[PDB]
C-alpha cells in the first residue's frame, strides 16, 4: 500500500529479471504499434508484459522496461505506481479481485467477500500461506448486470452465490481451471427469465440499406 520503494533482498535493482526471447519478439511487435519517436507509448504494455512473465514487478522489470524503451526510470515508476494492476509486491497464483462498488454491493457482494474470507482463511489484502490466492477488493470491473462478480487473473466469474465461488475456489485448488462466465442460468447479459429482445432472427446483409449506396 506504499508508493515508495525500499530495497529488500527479494526486491532490489540486482533482482534477476530479463525477458525471454519470445517476449522480446512480443515487445518488438508492441513498439511497432506506435509512431517513430514515441517509443515511450510502449511503457504500459511492455511493463504489463513484464507482469505476465514474472507475476509481479520487482524493481528490475521497471528498470529493464526503462532500459529497452530508452525512457527514464522515474517515468516507468510513475506508471507502475499509478495503475492498480501492476503488482509491485508478489501476489499469489490466483489473484482474486472482488468488486464491491454500488451495483455489486446492492446485489450482495459482501456475502461473497465473506465466503472467500472464510473459505481461504485470509482477509482482504492478505495471501494464503501456500501462495495460491491473493484476495483484494477492487472497484467496478464493468460487469454490473452480472453482479455479484469476481475476477481471477484474466477471467470474470459472474452472477455468483457463496456456493458458486466456493466451487470455483475448490476447482482452483484442485489444479483445474473454471469456466469464466455467469454461474446462474444465463449465458452473458440477457434477462434471466428469457429474452425480452433479439428473439427474431437477424435480417442479414442489405436490409434497410438506403438508395444511392
Amino acid at each position: 500500500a506504499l508508493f515508495v520503494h525500499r530495497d529488500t533482498p527479494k526486491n532490489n535493482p540486482e533482482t534477476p529479471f530479463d525477458f525471454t526471447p519470445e517476449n522480446y519478439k512480443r515487445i518488438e511487435a508492441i513498439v511497432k504499434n506506435y509512431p517513430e519517436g514515441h517509443k515511450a507509448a510502449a511503457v504500459l504494455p511492455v511493463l504489463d508484459l513484464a507482469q505476465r512473465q514474472n507475476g509481479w514487478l520487482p524493481i528490475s522489470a521497471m528498470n529493464k522496461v526503462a532500459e529497452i524503451l530508452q525512457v527514464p526510470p522515474m517515468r516507468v515508476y510513475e506508471v507502475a505506481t499509478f495503475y492498480t494492476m501492476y503488482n509491485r509486491k508478489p501476489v499469489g497464483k490466483y489473484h482474486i479481485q472482488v468488486c464491491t462498488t454500488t451495483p455489486c454491493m446492492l446485489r450482495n457482494s459482501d456475502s461473497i467477500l465473506e465466503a472467500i474470507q472464510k473459505k481461504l482463511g485470509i482477509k482482504v489484502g492478505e495471501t494464503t500461506p501456500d501462495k495460491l490466492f491473493t484476495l483484494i477488493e477492487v472497484e467496478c470491473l464493468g460487469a454490473c448486470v452480472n453482479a455479484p462478480m469476481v475476477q481471477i487473473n484474466d477471467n470474470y466469474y459472474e452472477d455468483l452465490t457463496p456456493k458458486d465461488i466456493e466451487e470455483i475456489i475448490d476447482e482452483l485448488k484442485a489444479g483445474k481451471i473454471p469456466k469464466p462466465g455467469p454461474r446462474s442460468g444465463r449465458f452473458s447479459c440477457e434477462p434471466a427469465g428469457g429474452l425480452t429482445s433479439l428473439t427474431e432472427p437477424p435480417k442479414g446483409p442489405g436490409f434497410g440499406v438506403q438508395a444511392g449506396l
Partner: protein
C-alpha cells in the same frame, strides 16, 4: 411521434448483443456487417459526416456531444501530422457494462465503425484503448481484427477502396480516469493517466500531438449502420435532439439485471418493468434510481414514474442521461451507504492531478463515511453541499463533477434521512 420504446428487432443496431450468434467474420457478415463498406468509403468524408449529422447521433460516452459536429472538427487539410481516431473502450463507470458487450459480441461492428469513422475524419489509424480488465474482450477484438486484416477489410487498401487504415488495440492498466479522453490519450502515450487541460481539444493536439478524435465504442459501432440505413432512419427514433437507439444496463435491485438495446426516449418505468422484470418487490418497493451510471445524481421514485430516458428529460429531472446505466435501489437500501461507497470509488479513482478533486473528493468521502454512521451534525450537510460546489466546475476534467453530483443528488432528495440518521446517532451515543 409522442410515445417511445417498444423497439422492434429489425431496428436493432446491435444484433448479437447476447452472444447467441457467431461474433466472428462469417457471423458478422451474415448479420449485415461489412456490407457495401467500399461504397461508403468512396463517397468521401463529407457524405459520412453529413449522415452522422443528419442522424442526430450524440456522444454515447455519456456527455452527449453531437457526434457529426465533433467528427467534423477533423475535416480539415493535413499539416504534416497524421490523424487518429481513438476508440474509448475503457468503460469504468459503475453500472455500465455495454461496451464490453459490443467488444465481446459484435467486434467487427466496432472495427467497421473504426474504418468508417476514420475515413470520415481522415484518420490514419484507430487506437482502441480497451480496459485492461477486459482481457478476454481484448483478445476477442484482436481475433476479429486479424479476421478483418486477412479479409482485406482493413489495412493496406481497406475494403478495396484505396484508403489505408490500421486498427490498434491498446490495453489499459486499471484506472477509471483513463476513460476521460485526454487522460486516455496520456495513457496511450505511456504516461500516467492524467487529463490534459482543454484547450487544446484533441482535434488540434491529441494523441502523440496529432489531430485526434476520441469516441465511445457505441457511437463508433453504430456509424456503419447509420451510413447504410441512413441518417433519417436513425433520427426517426427518440425525441428531437435525442435521436436513435441506446444500450441500457439495468442493474442493482431488479429481478433480471440485463443489457438491452431500446429506443431513445423510452420511459424509465417501462424500461425497468419490460426488460428487467421490474423492481424487486414491485414498483412500490422502488426507493431511488441512478439513471445513467455513478456520475449522474439519483432520482427518487416520484421522479422515476414519468421520466424519459434521453438526455433532455433527465436534464429536466436535474440528473443526467450519462452512460444510460440504470442502477435500481429498492426500499431496503441504505442509500447513504451506497452513495458513500460511490464517493469511495471516486476517491480511489481520482488521478490526483488538480487540487479540488485530489483534496475535496477525499474530504467528501470522509464526510460521507461519517454520514453513514450519523457521526455528524446537520450543519455539515450544507457544508458538504458547498464542498461539492467547490469541486464542480473548478477541476481539470469532469471526474470532480462526477463526484460532486452524487453528493448533490443524495442531499437534494434525501436530506431528511441524513438528518434522522444523525439525530439517532446523537440520541444513542450521548
Amino acid at each position: 411521434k409522442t410515445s417511445f420504446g417498444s423497439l422492434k428487432d429489425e431496428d436493432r443496431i446491435f444484433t448479437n448483443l447476447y452472444g447467441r450468434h457467431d461474433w466472428r467474420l462469417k457471423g458478422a457478415q451474415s448479420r449485415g456487417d461489412w456490407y457495401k463498406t467500399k461504397e461508403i468509403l468512396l463517397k468521401g468524408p463529407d457524405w459520412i459526416l453529413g449522415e452522422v449529422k443528419t442522424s442526430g447521433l450524440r456522444g454515447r460516452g455519456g456527455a452527449g456531444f453531437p457526434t457529426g459536429l465533433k467528427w467534423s472538427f477533423m475535416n480539415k487539410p493535413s499539416d504534416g501530422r497524421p490523424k487518429y481516431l481513438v476508440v474509448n473502450a475503457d468503460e469504468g463507470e459503475p453500472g455500465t457494462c455495454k461496451d464490453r458487450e459490443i467488444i465481446r459480441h459484435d467486434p467487427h461492428k466496432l472495427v467497421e465503425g473504426c474504418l468508417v469513422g476514420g475515413r470520415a475524419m481522415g484518420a490514419r489509424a484507430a487506437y482502441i484503448y480497451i480496459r485492461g480488465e477486459f482481457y478476454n474482450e481484448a483478445s476477442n477484438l484482436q481475433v476479429a481484427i486479424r479476421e478483418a486484416y486477412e479479409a482485406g477489410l482493413i489495412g493496406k487498401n481497406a475494403c478495396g477502396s484505396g484508403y489505408d487504415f490500421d486498427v490498434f488495440v491498446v490495453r489499459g492498466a486499471g484506472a477509471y480516469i483513463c476513460g476521460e479522453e485526454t487522460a486516455l490519450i496520456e495513457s496511450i502515450e505511456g504516461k500516467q493517466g492524467k487529463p490534459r487541460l482543454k484547450p487544446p481539444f484533441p482535434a488540434d493536439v491529441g494523441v502523440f500531438g496529432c489531430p485526434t478524435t476520441v469516441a465511445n465504442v457505441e457511437t463508433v459501432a453504430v456509424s456503419p449502420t447509420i451510413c447504410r440505413r441512413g441518417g433519417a432512419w436513425f433520427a426517426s427514433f427518440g425525441r428531437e435532439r435525442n435521436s436513435g437507439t441506446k444500450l441500457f444496463n439495468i442493474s442493482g435491485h431488479v429481478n433480471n439485471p440485463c443489457t438491452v438495446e431500446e429506443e431513445m426516449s423510452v420511459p424509465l418505468k417501462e424500461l425497468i418493468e419490460k426488460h428487467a422484470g421490474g423492481v424487486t418487490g414491485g414498483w412500490d418497493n422502488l426507493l431511488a434510481v441512478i439513471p445513467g451510471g455513478s456520475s449522474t445524481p439519483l432520482i427518487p421514485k416520484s421522479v422515476c414514474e414519468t421520466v424519459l430516458m434521453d438526455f433532455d428529460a433527465l436534464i429536466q429531472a436535474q440528473t443526467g442521461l450519462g452512460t444510460a446505466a440504470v442502477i435500481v435501489m429498492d426500499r431496503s437500501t441504505d442509500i447513504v451507504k451506497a452513495i458513500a461507497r460511490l464517493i469511495e470509488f471516486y476517491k480511489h479513482e481520482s488521478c490526483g492531478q488538480c487540487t479540488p478533486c485530489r483534496e475535496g473528493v477525499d474530504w467528501m468521502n470522509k464526510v460521507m463515511a461519517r454520514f453513514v454512521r450519523g457521526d455528524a451534525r446537520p450543519a455539515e450537510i450544507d457544508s458538504l453541499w458547498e464542498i461539492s460546489k467547490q469541486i464542480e466546475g473548478h477541476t481539470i476534467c469532469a471526474l470532480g463533477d462526477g463526484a460532486a453530483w452524487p453528493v448533490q443528488g443524495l442531499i437534494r432528495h434525501f436530506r431528511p434521512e441524513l438528518e434522522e440518521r444523525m439525530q439517532r446517532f446523537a440520541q444513542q451515543h450521548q
